[PDB]
Amino acid sequence: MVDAFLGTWKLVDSKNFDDYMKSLGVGFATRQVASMTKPTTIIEKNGDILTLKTHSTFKNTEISFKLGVEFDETTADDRKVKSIVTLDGGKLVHLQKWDGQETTLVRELIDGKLILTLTHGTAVCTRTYEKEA
Numbered sequence: 001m002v003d004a005f006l007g008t009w010k011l012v013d014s015k016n017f018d019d020y021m022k023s024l025g026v027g028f029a030t031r032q033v034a035s036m037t038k039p040t041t042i043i044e045k046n047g048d049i050l051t052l053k054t055h056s057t058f059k060n061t062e063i064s065f066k067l068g069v070e071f072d073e074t075t076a077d078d079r080k081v082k083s084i085v086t087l088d089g090g091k092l093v094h095l096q097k098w099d100g101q102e103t104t105l106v107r108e109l110i111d112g113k114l115i116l117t118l119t120h121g122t123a124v125c126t127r128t129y130e131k132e133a
């Protein structure tokens with residue numbers, strides 16, 4: 001089910017990430033640094049517990065979750081959110097809720113690349129990751 005997503009992924013394309021960060025209220029200096037950072041995303045499973053690590057020179061995050069079970073999360077920009085990750089149409093869909101707001105982080109595989117679509121408000125960011133060996 002989620003096997004094709006597992007492994008180590010490196011950022012290779014980013015569109016509209018500044019728009020997404022600005023929609024979330026991220027300050028200009030953080031958005032500068034973030035716009036030049038190329039994170040590595042590691043997705044691992046152990047039974048039905050997934051762990052998703054995002055590593056960079058600026059900030060690191062890690063979450064663990066079961067699909068379809070809500071979890072508390074503190075995001076890279078310090079939002080305290082209620083999260084759930086599920087498979088939907090073969091896509092790994094992560095929904096975050098806080099203060100009545102929502103954002104979605106949708107991952108899909110296209111030609112072996114991992115496409116992450118981030119939506120908040122009207123802002124839609126598309127980031128592309130390539131698999132590391």
Ligand SMILES: CC/C=C\C/C=C\C/C=C\C/C=C\C/C=C\C/C=C\CCC(=O)O
Pocket residue numbers: 011021024026030034037039041054055056058059060061075076077116127
């Ligand atoms: C954690 C390292 C990943 C990306 C950029 C570097 C530092 C992050 C700090 C601030 C960014 C601010 C807001 C972004 C909001 C949510 C984080 C979601 C996705 C990170 C981007 C990704 O996984 O490619």
